[PDB]
Amino acid sequence: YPANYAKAPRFKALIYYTQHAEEAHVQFAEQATTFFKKLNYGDGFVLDITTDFSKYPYEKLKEYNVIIMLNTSPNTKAERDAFEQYMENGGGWVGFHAAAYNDKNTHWPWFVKFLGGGVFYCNNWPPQPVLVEVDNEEHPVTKNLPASFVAPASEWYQWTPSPRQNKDVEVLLSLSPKNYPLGIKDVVNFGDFPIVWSNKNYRMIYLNMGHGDEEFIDGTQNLLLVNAFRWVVSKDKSGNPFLK
Amino acid sequence: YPANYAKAPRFKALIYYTQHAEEAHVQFAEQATTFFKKLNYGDGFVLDITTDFSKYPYEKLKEYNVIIMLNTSPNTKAERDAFEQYMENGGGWVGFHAAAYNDKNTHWPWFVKFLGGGVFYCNNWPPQPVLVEVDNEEHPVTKNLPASFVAPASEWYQWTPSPRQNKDVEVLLSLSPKNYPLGIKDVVNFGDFPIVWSNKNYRMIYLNMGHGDEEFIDGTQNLLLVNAFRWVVSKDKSGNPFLK
Amino acid sequence: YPANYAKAPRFKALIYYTQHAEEAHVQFAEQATTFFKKLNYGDGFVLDITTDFSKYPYEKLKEYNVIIMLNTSPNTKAERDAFEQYMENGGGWVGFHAAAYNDKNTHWPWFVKFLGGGVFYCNNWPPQPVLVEVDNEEHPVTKNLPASFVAPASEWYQWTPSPRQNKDVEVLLSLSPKNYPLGIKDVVNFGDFPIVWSNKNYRMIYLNMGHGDEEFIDGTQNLLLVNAFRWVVSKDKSGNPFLK
Ligand SMILES: [Cl-]
Ligand SMILES: [Cl-]
Ligand SMILES: [Cl-]
Ligand SMILES: [Cl-]
Ligand SMILES: [Cl-]
Ligand SMILES: [Cl-]
Ligand SMILES: [Cl-]
Ligand SMILES: [Cl-]
Ligand SMILES: [Cl-]
Ligand SMILES: [Zn+2]
Ligand SMILES: [Zn+2]
Ligand SMILES: [Zn+2]
Ligand SMILES: [Zn+2]
Ligand SMILES: [Zn+2]
Ligand SMILES: [Zn+2]
Ligand SMILES: [Zn+2]
Ligand SMILES: [Zn+2]
Ligand SMILES: [Zn+2]
Ligand SMILES: [Zn+2]
Ligand SMILES: [Zn+2]
Ligand SMILES: [Zn+2]
Ligand SMILES: [Zn+2]
Ligand SMILES: [Zn+2]
Ligand SMILES: [Zn+2]
Ligand SMILES: [Zn+2]
Ligand SMILES: [Zn+2]
Ligand SMILES: [Zn+2]
Ligand SMILES: [Zn+2]
Ligand SMILES: [Zn+2]
Ligand SMILES: [Zn+2]
Ligand SMILES: [Zn+2]
């Protein structure tokens, strides 16, 4: 029989986002929360949602297979330390857009290293669709994606160093250099442009998109999101929940 | 002159769907009805819509070039017998999603045979986009589609036997095995996965998608639907209405 | 450093459309105006919007890098003459859909010549998605587009002569002949079918799509629009504003 029907929820996931962000980043979080809610129709998993990460010390995080951060990262020492302990003890992460933002004022070296080394460098403006290219066509995140496709509008970040420079990072999707020169207000002219990657030392994926209220208009990118979430969940060292 | 402008409506079509179905299947029917209404702007055809197939014995069906079943099939003996006579006398059908659902309690062998032999076997859950592949790139349904593309979210059915096992069936679109393992709650791991086909003994096409309120977000799948409808309509043994 | 961040708005653009048009052409204009408004978040450029082109003699047009005509062309002699002088003195144009419509009753030979020679010939009906093909994969308008893709629904125009017959026209995107026979009410069976082009004697692009309230459902076509606008703006003989 080719199908494994769940008898009970398979794993637990936590969504964290903030309402204290530019409007477009709140809009994305709201819609992405709907996206994940719909993935949990029929209670395939346990999904908890919060705007307040202060209530989640490590002891209350450890039960989660994955934390999905839609728009921001922890900003207080206690929250940051809880997240670090979680990730260092085999926790899962799916991060979007400004959840990875960091700069000279972040003062969180653990997180810069968790991301693969990249500090924010530059971005195009305004948000626009772009041609994207799959770096590894065999990977579970991208095996059922077209090798290249146009992703819907976002503003896109470069980092320094590029995450690709880290041999422990696998870049999975990149913005094509065919997009250059990229931008109308703020124009990006050259450089490496990874947009989805994983630091292989952690059970984590980062996706650079997540801006505004039209990110779910295309099946292709929607499938990338499903795949990203599924991959991180499947890799739990305690057992692949999809085999239960 | 390369264009044939209609002087009058070209053919008649009937949409049948039910409101007595899970919410997502009612939503799809409603949106698909809008899709077809828009195709009939300017009265290219006569479009009648019903939620009550009991009012349509064979004598009242025979005038229709095609019946579009958006979410369900006839459930009473009288309705089933009217539909059988219609299809056996050269009628047209475009069916979606659970319009083909059948199982050990259906007790309608004519319809299982009409579909090509397949009884419901399994499905993934939750609805998600998937990579789909065109089986015959030359066919009128698929000649202007990309050879592979991502279709928007649905839950997808396997059947036993596969409709492909029937030599009288032409499979037109299939879910790629690159999608395996497919599912988060209910996981499909292997098997043939046709999703659009025609039993060549009838003027009919079946499309497995049709779930929820976001099935029309992509041009590509929208074009598949146009093409499916146009093909069945064009094949009327009484004459191709598009030549009038 | 690979990015050029604007210090001030880079150029000025004018949108003109009419509310005195079929509903679908007003809907497109409204949504396209939103699209351009969003491109101007953060004041990358100066964007002025009007439904009344009578207020724009040549002296008041000359300051604009580009005029975007979403649904119609000037109909009075004074408006037509202002637009002619503007375009003959290095002005920019991005036109959509019925902004290029012209027939035996237009009586504006300058404009027929500006467009590349084509008078309206025929169209399919109803609006539907179609397979489109990039004619020049290296051009700034199309270099980051897939070589072929399905565009969302519009009704599509043929012209006589084809704009392609003019050696001064570069055709950039064409409706594939794989779409033939095209139409349900009004059926197009053959012929050249360019849909995006530029008369190289002017700083102008024409895009045939622009019908209804669902033209922005796909990233790919959205990217074509961004690229079309950016290309015309970049070519200003007074200097590429993106270098400032
Ligand atoms: Cl803690
Ligand atoms: Cl977009
Ligand atoms: Cl997976
Ligand atoms: Cl009957
Ligand atoms: Cl989807
Ligand atoms: Cl056809
Ligand atoms: Cl003037
Ligand atoms: Cl469409
Ligand atoms: Cl450009
Ligand atoms: Zn606040
Ligand atoms: Zn500091
Ligand atoms: Zn510090
Ligand atoms: Zn491969
Ligand atoms: Zn490849
Ligand atoms: Zn290492
Ligand atoms: Zn953003
Ligand atoms: Zn009921
Ligand atoms: Zn029984
Ligand atoms: Zn029985
Ligand atoms: Zn071929
Ligand atoms: Zn092929
Ligand atoms: Zn046979
Ligand atoms: Zn369903
Ligand atoms: Zn779309
Ligand atoms: Zn009026
Ligand atoms: Zn006249
Ligand atoms: Zn005249
Ligand atoms: Zn090339
Ligand atoms: Zn090529
Ligand atoms: Zn010349
Ligand atoms: Zn139109």
Coordinates of C-alpha atoms in Angstrom, one line a residue, chain A:
Chain A
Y1 CA 0.0 0.0 0.0
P2 CA 1.7 3.2 -1.0
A3 CA 0.2 5.5 1.7
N4 CA 0.9 6.1 5.4
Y5 CA -2.2 7.8 6.9
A6 CA -1.5 9.6 10.2
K7 CA -3.3 8.1 13.3
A8 CA -2.4 11.2 15.5
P9 CA -0.6 14.5 15.0
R10 CA 3.0 13.7 13.9
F11 CA 5.1 16.5 15.4
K12 CA 4.8 19.9 17.0
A13 CA 5.6 23.3 15.3
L14 CA 5.8 26.8 16.7
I15 CA 5.3 29.9 14.7
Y16 CA 6.7 33.1 16.1
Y17 CA 6.3 36.5 14.5
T18 CA 6.0 40.1 15.6
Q19 CA 3.4 42.8 14.9
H20 CA 6.1 45.5 15.7
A21 CA 7.6 45.6 12.2
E22 CA 7.0 47.4 9.0
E23 CA 3.5 46.7 7.6
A24 CA 4.7 44.5 4.8
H25 CA 6.5 42.1 7.1
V26 CA 3.4 41.8 9.3
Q27 CA 1.3 41.1 6.2
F28 CA 3.6 38.3 5.1
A29 CA 3.6 36.8 8.6
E30 CA -0.2 36.8 8.7
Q31 CA -0.6 35.2 5.3
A32 CA 2.1 32.7 6.0
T33 CA 0.4 31.8 9.3
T34 CA -2.7 31.1 7.2
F35 CA -0.6 29.0 4.9
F36 CA 0.6 26.8 7.7
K37 CA -2.8 26.7 9.4
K38 CA -4.2 25.2 6.1
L39 CA -1.3 22.7 6.1
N40 CA -2.6 21.6 9.5
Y41 CA -6.2 21.1 8.5
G42 CA -7.1 17.7 9.9
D43 CA -4.4 18.0 12.6
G44 CA -1.5 16.4 10.8
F45 CA 0.7 18.2 13.4
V46 CA 0.3 20.4 16.5
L47 CA 0.7 24.0 15.5
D48 CA 1.1 26.7 18.2
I49 CA 1.3 30.4 17.3
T50 CA 2.8 33.2 19.3
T51 CA 3.8 36.9 19.0
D52 CA 5.7 36.6 22.4
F53 CA 8.8 34.5 22.4
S54 CA 9.5 35.6 26.1
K55 CA 7.2 32.8 27.2
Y56 CA 9.5 30.1 25.7
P57 CA 12.6 29.3 27.6
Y58 CA 14.5 26.3 26.4
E59 CA 12.5 23.8 28.5
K60 CA 9.3 24.9 26.8
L61 CA 10.9 24.9 23.3
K62 CA 12.5 21.5 23.4
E63 CA 9.2 19.7 22.7
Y64 CA 8.9 21.4 19.3
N65 CA 10.3 19.7 16.2
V66 CA 10.5 23.1 14.5
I67 CA 10.2 26.9 15.1
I68 CA 9.0 28.9 12.1
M69 CA 10.2 32.5 12.3
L70 CA 8.2 34.6 9.8
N71 CA 9.5 38.1 10.2
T72 CA 12.0 38.6 13.1
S73 CA 14.5 37.0 15.4
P74 CA 14.8 37.1 19.2
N75 CA 16.0 40.5 20.5
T76 CA 16.4 40.0 24.3
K77 CA 19.3 38.0 25.9
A78 CA 16.9 35.5 27.5
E79 CA 15.1 34.8 24.3
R80 CA 18.3 34.6 22.3
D81 CA 19.8 32.2 24.8
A82 CA 16.7 30.0 24.7
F83 CA 16.8 29.8 20.9
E84 CA 20.6 29.0 21.0
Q85 CA 20.1 26.2 23.4
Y86 CA 17.2 24.8 21.4
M87 CA 19.2 24.8 18.1
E88 CA 22.3 23.4 19.7
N89 CA 20.3 20.5 21.1
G90 CA 18.8 19.4 17.8
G91 CA 15.9 21.8 17.3
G92 CA 14.5 22.8 13.9
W93 CA 14.2 26.2 12.2
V94 CA 12.5 27.7 9.2
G95 CA 13.3 31.4 8.9
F96 CA 12.1 34.0 6.5
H97 CA 13.2 37.4 5.3
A98 CA 14.1 39.7 8.1
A99 CA 14.3 36.9 10.6
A100 CA 17.9 36.7 9.4
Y101 CA 18.5 40.5 9.3
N102 CA 21.6 41.4 11.3
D103 CA 24.0 44.3 11.3
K104 CA 26.7 46.0 13.3
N105 CA 24.2 46.7 16.1
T106 CA 22.8 43.2 16.5
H107 CA 25.5 42.0 19.0
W108 CA 24.6 38.3 18.5
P109 CA 27.6 36.5 17.2
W110 CA 26.1 33.1 17.8
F111 CA 23.3 33.9 15.4
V112 CA 25.6 35.3 12.7
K113 CA 27.5 32.0 12.8
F114 CA 24.2 30.0 12.9
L115 CA 23.1 31.7 9.7
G116 CA 26.5 30.8 8.0
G117 CA 28.4 34.0 8.6
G118 CA 26.5 36.6 6.5
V119 CA 25.9 40.1 7.9
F120 CA 23.4 42.2 5.9
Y121 CA 25.1 44.0 3.0
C122 CA 22.6 45.4 0.5
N123 CA 19.2 45.0 -1.1
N124 CA 17.2 46.1 -4.1
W125 CA 14.2 48.3 -3.9
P126 CA 11.3 48.2 -4.7
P127 CA 10.1 44.6 -4.2
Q128 CA 9.8 42.9 -7.5
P129 CA 9.7 39.4 -8.9
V130 CA 13.0 37.9 -10.0
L131 CA 14.3 34.9 -11.9
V132 CA 15.6 32.3 -9.5
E133 CA 17.8 29.2 -10.1
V134 CA 18.0 25.9 -8.2
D135 CA 21.5 25.2 -7.1
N136 CA 21.0 21.5 -6.4
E137 CA 18.3 19.9 -8.3
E138 CA 18.4 16.7 -6.3
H139 CA 17.9 18.1 -2.9
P140 CA 14.6 17.3 -1.0
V141 CA 13.8 21.0 -0.9
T142 CA 14.1 21.5 -4.7
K143 CA 13.8 18.0 -6.4
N144 CA 10.2 18.7 -7.6
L145 CA 10.8 22.4 -8.5
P146 CA 11.6 23.6 -12.0
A147 CA 15.3 24.3 -12.3
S148 CA 14.6 28.0 -12.8
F149 CA 11.4 30.0 -12.3
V150 CA 10.2 33.5 -11.5
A151 CA 9.5 34.1 -7.8
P152 CA 6.9 36.7 -6.8
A153 CA 7.8 40.1 -5.6
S154 CA 10.1 40.7 -2.6
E155 CA 13.0 42.8 -1.8
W156 CA 16.1 40.7 -1.8
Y157 CA 19.2 40.8 0.4
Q158 CA 22.9 40.3 -0.2
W159 CA 25.1 39.4 2.7
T160 CA 28.8 39.8 3.5
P161 CA 30.4 37.3 3.3
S162 CA 28.1 35.4 1.1
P163 CA 26.7 32.4 2.9
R164 CA 28.0 30.4 0.0
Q165 CA 31.6 31.1 1.1
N166 CA 31.0 28.9 4.1
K167 CA 31.8 25.3 3.2
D168 CA 29.3 24.2 5.8
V169 CA 26.5 26.0 4.0
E170 CA 24.5 24.4 1.2
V171 CA 23.0 27.1 -1.0
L172 CA 19.7 25.7 -2.5
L173 CA 18.2 28.6 -4.5
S174 CA 19.9 31.8 -5.9
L175 CA 18.7 34.9 -7.6
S176 CA 20.0 34.7 -11.2
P177 CA 22.6 37.3 -12.3
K178 CA 20.4 37.7 -15.4
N179 CA 18.3 39.9 -13.1
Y180 CA 21.2 42.5 -13.0
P181 CA 20.9 45.4 -12.9
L182 CA 18.3 44.8 -10.3
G183 CA 16.2 47.7 -8.9
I184 CA 14.5 50.9 -9.6
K185 CA 15.1 53.0 -6.4
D186 CA 18.0 51.0 -5.0
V187 CA 19.9 49.2 -7.7
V188 CA 22.1 46.1 -7.2
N189 CA 24.6 45.6 -10.0
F190 CA 26.6 42.5 -9.3
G191 CA 27.5 39.9 -6.7
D192 CA 26.6 36.4 -5.5
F193 CA 22.9 36.3 -4.6
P194 CA 21.9 33.2 -2.6
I195 CA 18.3 33.3 -1.3
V196 CA 17.6 29.9 0.2
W197 CA 20.3 27.9 2.1
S198 CA 21.1 25.7 5.0
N199 CA 23.9 25.7 7.5
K200 CA 24.5 21.9 7.6
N201 CA 25.6 22.1 11.2
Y202 CA 22.0 22.8 12.2
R203 CA 18.5 21.5 11.3
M204 CA 17.6 24.8 9.7
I205 CA 16.7 26.5 6.5
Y206 CA 16.5 30.2 5.6
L207 CA 14.4 31.7 2.8
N208 CA 15.0 35.3 1.9
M209 CA 11.5 36.1 0.6
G210 CA 8.7 37.3 2.8
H211 CA 7.4 40.7 2.0
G212 CA 3.8 42.0 1.7
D213 CA 0.4 40.5 0.9
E214 CA 1.0 38.8 -2.4
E215 CA 3.7 36.2 -1.7
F216 CA 1.4 33.2 -2.2
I217 CA 0.2 34.0 -5.7
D218 CA 2.2 31.3 -7.4
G219 CA 2.2 27.5 -7.0
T220 CA 5.9 27.2 -7.6
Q221 CA 7.1 29.3 -4.7
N222 CA 4.3 27.9 -2.5
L223 CA 5.8 24.4 -3.2
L224 CA 9.2 25.7 -2.2
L225 CA 7.7 26.6 1.2
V226 CA 6.0 23.3 1.7
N227 CA 9.2 21.5 0.8
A228 CA 11.4 23.7 3.1
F229 CA 9.1 23.0 6.1
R230 CA 8.8 19.3 5.3
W231 CA 12.6 18.8 4.9
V232 CA 13.5 20.4 8.2
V233 CA 10.7 18.5 10.0
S234 CA 11.8 15.2 8.5
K235 CA 15.4 15.5 9.6
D236 CA 14.7 15.3 13.4
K237 CA 17.4 13.2 15.0
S238 CA 14.8 11.6 17.2
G239 CA 13.1 10.1 14.1
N240 CA 11.4 11.2 10.9
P241 CA 7.9 12.0 12.0
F242 CA 6.6 11.1 8.4
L243 CA 7.5 7.5 9.0
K244 CA 5.3 7.1 12.2

